[PDB]
Design a binder for these strands. Structure first.
Lengths: 91, 25, 62, 197, 126, 97, 100, 229
RNA sequence: GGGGACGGGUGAAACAGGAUGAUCCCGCCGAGACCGCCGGCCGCGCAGGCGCCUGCCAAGACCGCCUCUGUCAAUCAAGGGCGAAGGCCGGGGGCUAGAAGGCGAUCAGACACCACCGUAUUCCCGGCCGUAAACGGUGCCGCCCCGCGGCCGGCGCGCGCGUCCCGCCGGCCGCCCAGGGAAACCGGGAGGCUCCGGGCUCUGGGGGGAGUAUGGCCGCAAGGCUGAAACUUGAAGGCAUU
């Protein structure tokens, strides 16, 4: 277990190549891209990436637009809230 | 703060010795 | 315009050298308001001062 | 194929006739298959809906904004990009928006925009890592890659050209009124160099 | 009688007198200590304020503002909160000038929990 | 030599207090250590108050009082004489002077 | 800022009471007029919600929504699975989940 | 106004003054008259004075008692202009700074609650209310601070009384009730029961939502003294 | 939108802002930070620390009790967790201040203090880092120990009867007789100590060299933790008096 002691957990493939900075950055993006996210409908952690921006929940069978490497991006989470607050305020 | 500034000056000498050893290595 | 205003009390002189005395002036020629008015020169109570720009009141606040 | 942002097939009813018409839209984040998207002057402020910018309230993140009314899309179309409503002048029927660049544009209040931030956000955060990953991205776009520096090329091929050592020769800065084959380095640079801010 | 709002503000560096339309959307007179003085140091001073109100009093009388409502203000915000040297002058001029009052009020901006103030934690070390 | 039992501060059963700013020095002082004087002084001077009261065209007008809590740092306060250096025995003495 | 029933009573119903988790047993219970209260979730699919709300109208059965999430209705019932709709057929005690 | 009948200064040579009339609840309804540039035809003078906020003390609006009414100011924004006179609509109220500073005293607990209140007239008005705790008539301790129970009970009371008194009120009714101040008195009866309160009053009301086309309100609140009872 | 020449800034200045109309006033509009006055010899938390509405989620002391258990304890290497700020790796953000930097001044020189501008930073999330005058400069568990009050949290004794009195208190504190100390001062201990011994764990042995050298461990780094010797030298230091 813990076959890779350091943060070469998904970046073991690159081997001794590309430099530490690129591999560290890839750890975060790669782990996020192949992670399972919770579908806002199925409520099951089954959302996986099909392409950059496209995420599908295997059980809910629903495709949703998202960030390239995460189902939900921080800017988007804030925008949904701003649009909700402004909408509720207008009505 | 002479003691605070004196610790800072030892740090610099410690780095210079630590780095000089690597060039010698 | 020059106004006539007499001293009401001769207060202790300030000015850092003691030169300028403090005096209270009631415009005997009008509404009698006793505004404080700093004075340079020897003064005694009831000496009339003819000036009263009236755009200035003295500071004696401690 | 060449766009990072996901697209979306939204089917509207045919108003003109009896069938169903399919529209292709740049997808805001959060839109899902089987969503109901309303494009109208009387449309609610939900992500996906298209409403005129006067109707959109100030501070709202908008994307696929129209530069001029009935232009069917122009500004804020790339992954992650958005425009924000800054102010509405109801006398001039104009709305100030801040383009993703920061530049503020006064567009007609009639111009339409899709509520939301384009999806695909944070695509350039990942390093390309290998030349091969670049070749795959550019193959879906145009022959612009790989890039040879002009100081690498011979005197004929580029103005930077070549000598005994690889040097730009004269200053890289070129005038805005250069000639079409002469504008090659930094065109009309107001300033050059790395700096604070 | 007629009223307006005087909106006097005095702070370090200058004193500002602004008679208005009682809505604040419109103005009748905006004279300041700096306009009537030649010394940068004496812009907040009372005598500069006294002269500046005198010149302001003439415009307000022309527009027939019989009385005014004072909204004395200090720089406020993340600092100050204490009026400057000329703030009493701009009221004293109106009352001596005979401009009637009826509403002297305080309009200093006060923070309900503030941001950060300029100076550093060791403060203005003069 | 511990000059004061209070240690200059009234923090008791505490480890940290709110930071405040010297009103003149604009320096960060622990809330307990700060001078924290309070002034309820009225807006206009006592003399102007009679002139303004006669001028006011509203009946029952009274001069508005202005309320502020002046907080000054030790160096700021002692220099402007808000507080004063006291004798060893008079340092122990408290109460408003 | 500014659950006696939304968290504690769901637990009291589970401790003492007949509860049926799941949409399928809920529909069959509303159809038989055997459900006291119906507790849907925010995630409940829009079609399966509108029908459960129609059946509940003809069957005069109160329908309320959990604060949100099929997943978090399961956490409340102490179950490890999502519960889009829960039908309470017999309650142990207290019902402010109805909230009138 | 010194322009239509008088020369005035150069910018005010072309700026007429139109009167502003407060709503019928107040016994004296003339807040003042507003200067506006005479219409050049590009801009109608009336539409420039269509929305214009004023701050008017209650002591002035209902003349007489200044001991009560003096430290309360009512924001009155024209939402209409008719026959020149710019009729004004309630834009909220605010206690004066002079009163606010006096209320705070050391050694006491301040309890302050805010509550958005819906109106039958389609308005949503936030109500900002304040409370202070008072030393008992014969109490040994100097400190007037209360215990958490009383603090929780006080807060609950302010919210309940506000809903009971203003739950279904309409804007004209709310203005009259605020002028009477029984809203503050209604708070006092409940708050006095748990503990002695220095002061329980509505500091400010804020118009969070305003219905478009407030023409009906302008007629009811301002136009008729009979409608204003 | 109005109305109009300066505005700023200061110890005095100067640099930037303003007839493309600034400052100023009011009306809005949006972001980000922050929770003012109440706010304390107040409270709470293991410390670091803790303040909008504080819904809802688990806790924690304290007090009360003829509830229960029956030595289940105290302190601790090794080992673990937590840890202000600054920093760091990588996102989100970015208002305000503002390490860098740039510019006025100020000086003999300031490249410093004072203006003005401003990057990192400051805020949020996911990791690091492991230090602070992290201080009550005072380890923890006990036992006794004199008066005089205050404050907060329970609980009783009574009394016309009030957030009154009187206790028991659990803490937070002031002052102090003995007692202690080189004294300052502690006296809810720093007392019960040359009349020297309840228990436990840590640390120091004249000053430099030196928290250096070297080895280890830990960290991405910055560094942290452990930790000498050669050599040199008569004082360094405490609290008080004039």
């Amino acid at each position: 277990m813990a076959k890779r002691t350091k943060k070469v957990g998904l970046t073991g493939k690159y081997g001794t190549r590309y430099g530490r900075a690129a591999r560290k950055q890839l750890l975060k993006i790669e782990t996020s891209q192949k992670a399972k996210y919770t579908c806002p409908f199925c409520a099951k952690d089954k959302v996986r990436r099909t392409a950059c921006g496209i995420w599908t929940c295997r059980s809910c069978s629903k495709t949703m637009a998202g960030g390239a490497y995460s189902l939900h991006t921080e800017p988007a989470n804030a925008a949904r809230a701003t649009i909700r607050r402004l909408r509720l305020a207008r009505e | 703060m002479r003691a605070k500034w004196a610790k800072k000056r030892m740090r610099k000498l410690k780095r210079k010795r630590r780095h000089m050893k690597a060039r010698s290595k | 315009e020059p106004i006539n205003a007499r001293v009401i009390e001769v207060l202790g002189r300030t000015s850092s050298r003691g030169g300028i005395t403090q005096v209270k002036v009631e415009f005997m020629t009008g509404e009698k308001r006793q505004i404080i008015r700093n004075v340079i020169g020897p003064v005694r109570k009831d000496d009339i001062l003819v000036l009263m720009e009236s755009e200035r009141e003295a500071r004696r606040l401690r | 194929r060449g766009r990072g942002a996901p697209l979306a097939r939204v089917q509207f009813p045919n108003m003109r006739g009896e069938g169903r018409v399919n529209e292709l839209f740049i997808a805001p984040e959060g839109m899902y298959t089987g969503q109901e998207v309303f494009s109208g002057n009387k449309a609610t402020l939900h992500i996906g809906n298209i409403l005129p910018v006067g109707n959109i309230p100030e501070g709202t993140y908008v994307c696929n904004v129209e530069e001029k009314p009935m232009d069917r899309g122009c500004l804020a179309r790339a992954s992650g990009t958005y425009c924000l409503v800054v102010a509405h002048n109801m006398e001039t029927n104009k709305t100030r928006i801040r383009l993703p660049s920061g530049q503020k544009k006064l567009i007609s209040s009639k111009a339409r925009a899709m509520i939301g931030l384009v999806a695909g956000g944070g695509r350039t955060d990942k390093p390309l890592l290998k030349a091969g990953n670049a070749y795959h991205k550019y193959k879906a776009k145009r022959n612009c890659w790989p890039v040879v520096r002009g100081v690498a090329m011979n005197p004929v091929d580029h103005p930077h050209g070549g000598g005994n050592h690889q040097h730009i020769g004269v200053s890289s800065c070129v005038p805005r009124n250069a000639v079409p084959g002469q504008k090659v380095g930094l065109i009309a640079a107001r300033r050059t160099g790395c700096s604070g801010g | 009688e007629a009223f307006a709002v005087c909106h006097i503000y005095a702070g370090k560096n200058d004193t500002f007198i602004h008679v208005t339309d009682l809505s604040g959307r419109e103005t009748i007179g905006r004279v300041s200590g700096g306009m009537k003085v030649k010394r940068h140091c004496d812009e907040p001073s009372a005598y500069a304020a006294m002269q500046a109100t005198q010149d302001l009093i003439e415009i307000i009388t022309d527009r027939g503002i019989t009385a005014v409502h004072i909204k004395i203000r200090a720089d406020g915000g993340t600092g100050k909160r204490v009026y400057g040297g000329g703030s009493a002058a701009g009221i004293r001029a109106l009352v001596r000038g005979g401009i009637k009052i009826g509403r002297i009020e305080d309009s200093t901006p006060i923070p309900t929990d503030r941001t950060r103030h300029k100076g550093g934690r060791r403060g203005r070390r003069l | 030599p511990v000059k004061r039992r209070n240690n200059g501060r009234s923090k008791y059963n505490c480890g940290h207090t709110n930071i405040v700013r010297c009103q003149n020095c604009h320096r960060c002082v622990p809330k307990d250590k700060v001078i924290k004087r309070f002034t309820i002084r009225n807006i206009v001077d006592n003399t102007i108050a009679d002139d303004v009261l006669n001028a006011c065209v509203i009946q029952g007008f009274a001069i508005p009082k202005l309320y502020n809590k002046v907080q000054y740092c030790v160096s700021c306060s002692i220099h402007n004489h808000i507080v004063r250096v006291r004798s060893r025995e008079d340092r122990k003495i408290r109460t408003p002077p | 800022s500014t659950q006696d029933s939304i968290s504690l009573t769901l637990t009291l119903v589970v401790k003492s009471g007949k509860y049926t988790l799941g949409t399928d047993q809920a529909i069959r219970n509303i159809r038989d007029g055997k459900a006291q209260l119906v507790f849907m979730a925010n995630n409940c699919p829009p079609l399966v919600k509108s029908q459960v709300d129609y059946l509940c109208h003809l069957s005069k059965t109160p329908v309320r929504v959990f604060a949100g999430s099929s997943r978090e209705l399961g956490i409340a019932v102490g179950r490890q699975f999502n519960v889009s709709i829960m039908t309470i057929l017999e309650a142990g005690d207290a019902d402010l989940t109805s909230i009138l | 106004k010194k322009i239509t009948q008088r020369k005035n200064p150069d910018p005010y040579l072309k700026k007429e003054w139109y009167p502003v009339i407060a709503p019928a609840h107040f016994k004296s309804r003339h807040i003042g008259q507003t200067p506006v540039t005479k219409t050049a035809g590009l801009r109608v003078a009336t539409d420039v004075i269509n929305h214009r906020v004023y701050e008017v003390n209650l002591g002035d609006l209902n003349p007489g008692a200044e001991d009560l009414n003096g430290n309360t100011k009512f924001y009155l924004q024209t939402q209409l202009v008719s026959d020149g006179k710019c009729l004004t609509n309630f834009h909220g109220m605010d206690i004066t700074r002079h009163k606010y500073g006096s209320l705070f005293r050391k050694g006491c607990d301040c309890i302050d609650v805010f509550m958005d209140i819906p109106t039958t007239d389609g308005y949503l008005l936030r109500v900002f209310v304040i409370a202070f705790t008072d030393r008992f008539r014969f109490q040994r301790r100097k400190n007037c601070h209360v215990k958490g129970r009383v603090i929780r009970m006080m807060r609950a009371g302010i919210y309940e009384t506000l809903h009971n008194e203003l739950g279904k009120v309409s804007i004209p009714v709310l203005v009259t009730k605020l002028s009477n101040f029984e809203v503050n008195a209604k708070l006092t009866e409940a708050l006095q029961k748990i503990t002695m309160c220095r002061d329980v009053m509505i500091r400010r009301v804020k118009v969070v939502k305003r219905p478009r086309n407030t023409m009906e309100l302008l007629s009811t609140m301002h136009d008729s003294n009979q409608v204003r009872n």
